[PDB]
Symmetry: D2
Subunit: 243 residues, 4 copies
Amino acid sequence: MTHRVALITGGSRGIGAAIALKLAQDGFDIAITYARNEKAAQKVVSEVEALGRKAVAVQADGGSTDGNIAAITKTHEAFGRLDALVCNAGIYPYGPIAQMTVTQIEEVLNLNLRAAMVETVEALKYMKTGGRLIYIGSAFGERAPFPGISLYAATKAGLIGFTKGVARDLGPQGITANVVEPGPIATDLNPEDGAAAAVIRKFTATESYGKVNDIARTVSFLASPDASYITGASILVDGGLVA
Amino acid sequence: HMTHRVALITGGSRGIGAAIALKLAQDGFDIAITYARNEKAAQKVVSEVEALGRKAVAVQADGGSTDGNIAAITKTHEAFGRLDALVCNAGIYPYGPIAQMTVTQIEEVLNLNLRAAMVETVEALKYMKTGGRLIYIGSAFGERAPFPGISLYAATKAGLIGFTKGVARDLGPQGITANVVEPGPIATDLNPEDGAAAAVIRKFTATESYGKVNDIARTVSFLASPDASYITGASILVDGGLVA
Amino acid sequence: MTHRVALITGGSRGIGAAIALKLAQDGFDIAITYARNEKAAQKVVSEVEALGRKAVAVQADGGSTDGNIAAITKTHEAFGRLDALVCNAGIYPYGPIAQMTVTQIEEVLNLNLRAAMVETVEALKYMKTGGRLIYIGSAFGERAPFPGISLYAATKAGLIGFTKGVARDLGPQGITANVVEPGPIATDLNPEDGAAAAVIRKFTATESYGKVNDIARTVSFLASPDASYITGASILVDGGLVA
Amino acid sequence: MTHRVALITGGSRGIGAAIALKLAQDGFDIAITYARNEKAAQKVVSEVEALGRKAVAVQADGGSTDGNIAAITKTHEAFGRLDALVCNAGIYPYGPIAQMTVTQIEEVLNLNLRAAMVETVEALKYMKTGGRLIYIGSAFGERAPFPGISLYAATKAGLIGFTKGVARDLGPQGITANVVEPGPIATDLNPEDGAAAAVIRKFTATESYGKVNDIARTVSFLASPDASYITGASILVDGGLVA
């Protein structure tokens, strides 16, 4: 228990993986959650270990409350402490509101909002003064500039409200709660080239997609002990999309 | 049959919902209201709408189940043959520090305060046409959480802001508007304006007062008007200055 | 002094004129300010008088503090009371920030923010419980979706902040302060035709410009004695532009 | 011209001074503006020089457009380049809106909003891709929780709008514009003492004043070359006041 411990949900690839590595460099031991691809998770585990930190991968369905609880539980069993929770796992449904099914609605709520709520409750059994709760929201929580993202925008705006309320509750306990709001970020699964990306890019002021490091450095900034006076905050990292 | 616009108000058997139902009826809407259990309160609202010259019906439905959300729309369309406004008013207010919340409270608030609006909206769009109105009852606490104990409620109510923005964007060219009304503390039977707890909440308002159900009903009426066609994606705080 | 009195700045044409007529129908006696164009002001005065209300036109440069003070002073001399102030006068500079001159900066601050502030202070020498302060902001105070409007967006966001602070101050005195935020509204001066308008329109969800009645109705809704619980609020009337 | 150059207005004391030292440590040569108090300014200069950087203090009235222009001009004359502008100078009027004079209104507008606008225009004559514009706003630009701060809230909300519009204009040029929003910060100029301070603390979720380093760290985070995808953003550093 000599190092701070960070749990990153969906930490096996993309933004999550980059956060895990950045926090490991900052001196956190690392737990990540993954739904299915054990090999991608073990790769992240190895890269964290190559930096001299301990890492563990926990299999968990972020869409289930049992999986939300088990992620915290297994992290605490592995390390004996919990210092930062980064709720990064999420999905992006896309389509006109009139075509959305009950299943899509339940899925996006369960993964993008309920998970964060349930994981936060469970984390607070273990977290102490100096703790950090960081939610990965979206710029689309503040602006929905094109059709097809009503469900996503709802869940991501929900995280802003949750963050404000939690920050208010935990202020005197010395735990902070903040939301990072990515714009379009290039990853394997979300490429920056092509006509669909061009449409999204046009709503950014920089006319570009960002990169995973743009988010990881902002999580690192918030997770620092020196960020003790930042709570309730939202940080847009979006190339000016919401401007 | 079908000569008047029809409004469905969820949770319309008492408090804000009931007042919205009466105000819309006076504006010329036939009324459907949902209720979970108190049939007598629902029938009282039905009678008061009828006394104003409109048709009214009360539909029993659990807003916390998706089947109830679908049925509310289905039964309203069966009774009246059209749907012109949906007012998603039903909701619950859990209270307590976040570390004391249970899984069940979390599911219940999400199910009623957010999922219901989403599923009801999808179903309403099977029937709604140009000139339609989607009006969600959010809260001032969706924008400001000035004291501890309201994390879950704030989350769901902020969620409705984001949903409203996205839906407004989707439906703009179809001539259906989507807007959110954000009440501060409103006095009702269940939420009285007197007592030490209310004195604390009241101090966060600029007017140092609770509002009344008419404050919210009027605002719904303003948004539901056909003349409100250029208002969409909007939030209207009716909160005595709480969020200032 | 039998009727409530509303002062509307810039009330001789466009949005201002439509507000003046709508409030006259609601039962307010009317004062309007005009910078130039006495004949347009006198037409508004006649239309208000045709409805049975008293009306006066006051010449005043909204960009000078002496004009800001005189507008209130002359209104109170003509009617003996003041019940609503609608700060509608303003300008819309357009262009890249690096090309803006000191003169354009001063002019927009003077007319779009300083005027509202000075007029509000003067109005509060006469206003009592039941009073109404209504500022005409802009949707661009909340979203600046294209280049060229940095100055305008600054002043119109400034009104939002002013509104919040004033609402807070005046709460216990029974005066409300609220901002109406128009999107693009078709008027004589802002036609609706042309490639520029086509670009703006595409940012709205309705893909249309609004009309003056959309704003007048909203002012009327706020100015009512039944709007006593609405204070600090912003109302977007923008066809979904800010969505 | 081997190092990046940062100009910090009001950089002789409090938040400004802390920002100047932090950016010096990040590797910026430093220009600071001061109105009066040359000895405080010369102290900051000496501390920057002790770190191995070049520093200069420029006397300038931030409330005069000539002073706004001269700050940039003298900075460019000393160093031959400009890489970051931090608009930190400002004032905090306090009192009920009805008691505010025309002189107070002009003053707050001139120092808190016009200065930033004019300095930004002049800076863009020299700044290039990789440039940083960072405005020091306030949490009170988003929330005015008590009476007496209308004017200040207006100017600070104005900066948010200005930041959004500027970010939108400069996005494709590779210059970012962002606003930091301090809550109550204990400073040499704004001590954590008295009944007014006691009232302000109670609105924060942490029930505390912050410290200058809380702001300086955040400016440093935004001024980095790795912050390129952050633009149009506001970062609350306010102990949860706006929650």
